[PDB]
């Protein structure tokens, strides 16, 4: 909500408001942004937490949503998302876990991920093949850089690949002050030990750590969350 508002808000407002500069300069805006990197940032709950902060329309689109038991439904959901998004009011679409479906095996005999690459590369067909992409874009993100799709190098495709490293004390302090920017924070949380113990913990698991900190705070007697309760929640879940 705090450490990413310029690329987001500018990247969603400029293709509709800055059209005058687009006609005066002849420059198209970027379309795809990739919020990749090692886990621990919480791109799902924090990116979705920022989609409501965009104040625009939002439409959910997850992994098991596109993948159906029947065949041919992937194109139906792609053209449906282009009906509501491309035809209806401008909505925001944020997908996640794109690297797990970007596998390119050598043996073409049994792989569902390549049919997910038929729907996915069909969307890339409807983005590279369709030049007028000034309307609703496509936003994707991955939790690992093990198998990166090499065919994502285009302005309409995922171009602005913003790398987010391991959530160090500075980064964990940023996303944790975004996650704890409104709640009752006592003036004694140094965030040093508890931000150091947050290893291999995604933003959802760190939110669960915040809940577990929100559990014993009734029997501790203090109505405000303390410093040691975070690491107590870490050592409580694992």
């Amino acid at each position: 909500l705090d450490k990413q508002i310029q690329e987001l808000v500018e990247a969603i407002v400029l293709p509709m408001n800055h059209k005058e500069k687009f006609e005066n300069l002849g420059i198209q805006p970027p379309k795809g942004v990739l919020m990749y990197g090692p886990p621990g940032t919480g791109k799902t709950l924090l990116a979705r937490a920022c989609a409501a902060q965009t104040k625009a329309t939002f439409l959910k689109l997850a992994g098991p949503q596109l993948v159906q038991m029947f065949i041919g439904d992937g194109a139906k959901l792609v053209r449906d998302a282009f009906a509501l998004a491309k035809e209806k009011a401008p909505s925001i679409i944020f997908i996640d876990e794109l690297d797990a479906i970007g596998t390119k095996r050598f043996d073409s005999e049994k792989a569902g991920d390549r049919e997910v690459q038929r729907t996915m590369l069909e969307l890339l067909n409807q983005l590279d093949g369709f030049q007028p992409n000034t309307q609703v874009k496509v936003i994707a993100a991955t939790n690992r850089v093990d198998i990166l799709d090499p065919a994502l190098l285009r302005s309409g495709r995922l171009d602005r690949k913003i790398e987010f490293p391991m959530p160090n004390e500075e980064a964990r302090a940023r996303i944790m002050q975004i996650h704890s920017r409104k709640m009752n924070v006592s003036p004694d949380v140094n965030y040093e030990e508890l931000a150091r113990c947050t290893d291999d913990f995604n933003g959802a698991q760190c939110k669960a750590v915040c809940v577990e900190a929100g559990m014993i705070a009734l029997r501790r007697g203090a109505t405000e969350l303390t410093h040691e309760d975070y690491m107590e929640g870490i050592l409580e879940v694992q």
């Binding site: 098991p64 709640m183 959802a204 698991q205 939110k207 929100g214 705070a217 109505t223």
Partner: protein
Amino acid sequence: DPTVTMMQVEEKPDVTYSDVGGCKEQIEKLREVVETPLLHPERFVNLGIEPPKGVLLFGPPGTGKTLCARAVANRTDACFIRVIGSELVQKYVGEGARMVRELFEMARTKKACLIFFDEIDADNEVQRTMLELINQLDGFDPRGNIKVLMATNRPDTLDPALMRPGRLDRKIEFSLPDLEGRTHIFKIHARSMSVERDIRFELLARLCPNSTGAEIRSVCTEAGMFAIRARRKIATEKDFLEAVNKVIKSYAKFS
């Protein structure tokens, strides 16, 4: 009004908290989520982000249909709405969405009533009910703070490997049988037909080691069937002792 609507409302307060024994840690971890968030709503809103959503109860049956009964009895006198899993998989599919939306509408009529799904362990006809069931429980349309708990025997893991890291958490077990825990279930079976209090409960509880809640429920059930069969007036273990050791040993052979 279908039978599921008139039967869906829970009444007749069943087994109470007096059966606290054995698995006390997890029953507290699931009691502080059904009792505390509704009884003390102000210090959970002022305490931080949101109160705990719920837990999960899978694994062995053990003392099933007794802990949800405990959650019904220990209610704050505002009875909640529970759903059985047998209504999900039935003939003439498609009505599951109208049902799962009409019970949420009844929850809106009942000032955000708590919704519980019992025995979830009961293929597009299922994919629509589980994907739309996630789109309704995990959706913010009805409510996101009422109740989420799946107490069942089998998890039927279709997409929990990636749908577990989120609003649902606290992977724990259901219960486990102990030696000294059964005397509380006997103490709540004292609330049944008047049994002669001269028979010590520990004497009946120490002669059935490693007996789950269903096995002792079959003790106080088959002992009742063979008690009314004997055509007597009062229940004494000197008469149906063969029913007791027969029902714990003949059933202990395979279970």
